[PDB]
Design a protein around this ligand. Structure first.
Ligand code: OHB
Ligand code: OHB
Ligand code: CL
Ligand code: CL
Ligand code: CL
Length: 163
């Protein structure tokens, strides 16, 4: 575990992270995808061997010895708000199990279901709160990656508020 487990946020490409493993915002079929998923495919293409996994789950594939945790958030275009909320919470609980199993001291994580899978809604708070619910009981250093300057400030505020 980390000596003093923390949350941090950085506004940069998750493919350039400084952590011991990465969470991919994957699609269920293990396809190259868009946004985070396409950056992860360019950086760690070997980790897409048999990465397909259902919505609400996470499947880890090694790229060399570097673990890529493929986490499948729901597409809110297809799910009801209620069922989508349930699957989004479940994906993050499976990420926490994988981070724990791997015995890593740090993890790079995007906000699941906030891009193409958001169904055109702002889900920063919804996705971040499910991330905290899952990861608060883990002792890894968590580093959240985002692109938007206003999202960086809002994620930083939410982290700082809890202390
Ligand atoms: N400003 C950027 O280029 C950037 C920042 C965060 C994530 C992906 C990116 O391409
Ligand atoms: N490559 C990225 O990390 C990125 C790309 C799109 C949106 C958010 C992100 O953090
Ligand atoms: Cl960058
Ligand atoms: Cl997304
Ligand atoms: Cl963002």
């Amino acid at each position: 575990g980390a000596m003093a487990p923390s949350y941090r946020v950085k506004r940069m490409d998750i493919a350039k992270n400084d952590e011991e493993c990465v969470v991919n915002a994957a699609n269920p079929r293990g396809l190259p995808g868009d946004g985070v998923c396409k950056a992860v495919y360019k950086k760690w293409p070997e980790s897409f061997k048999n990465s397909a996994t259902p919505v609400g789950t996470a499947k880890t594939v090694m790229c060399g010895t570097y673990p890529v945790i493929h986490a499948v958030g729901p597409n809110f275009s297809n799910y009801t708000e209620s069922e989508g909320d349930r699957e989004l919470a479940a994906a993050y609980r499976e990420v926490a199990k994988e981070v724990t199993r791997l015995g890593v001291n740090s993890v790079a994580i995007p906000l699941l279901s906030t891009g193409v899978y958001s169904g055109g809604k702002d889900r920063l708070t919804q996705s971040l709160n499910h991330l905290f619910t899952a990861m608060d009981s883990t002792d890894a250093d968590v580093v959240i990656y985002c692109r938007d300057k206003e999202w960086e400030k809002k994620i930083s505020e939410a982290i700082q508020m809890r202390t």
